[PDB]
Amino acid sequence: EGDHKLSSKARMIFNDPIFNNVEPFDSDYDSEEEKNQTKKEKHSRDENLPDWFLEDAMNARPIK
Amino acid sequence: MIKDKDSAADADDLESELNAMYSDYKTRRSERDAKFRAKQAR
């Protein structure tokens, strides 16, 4: 037994290496700017009817 | 044996069935070669 404060399962589970040292100019990233850039890239890369009706290289020459 | 009738829900169900049939047909016709299955795996 050993008379530990925590149970056997609690000890084995919470002794895992992941639980190490665990006890109880300046800029912040601009999400809006990257969203706008992604939208702009999406536009520069390119309803009610059923789908069965509507549907009816930089390595090209390397040294080797 | 269900004694009920719906006006537009029947049309929606029929369209959904047709879409599912078309998707299954496309998948069956495309899976004839294992290259397509390998590509769809990733």
Binding site: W52 | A11, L14, E15, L18, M21, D24, Y25, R28
Partner: peptide, 19 residues
């Protein structure tokens, strides 16, 4: 599977035109 066999071609076409 391939359940489309439950509908013959003419039934399927005449229901497709309904939509």
């Amino acid at each position: 599977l391939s359940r489309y066999v439950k509908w013959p071609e003419y039934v399927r076409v005449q229901r497709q035109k309904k939509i």
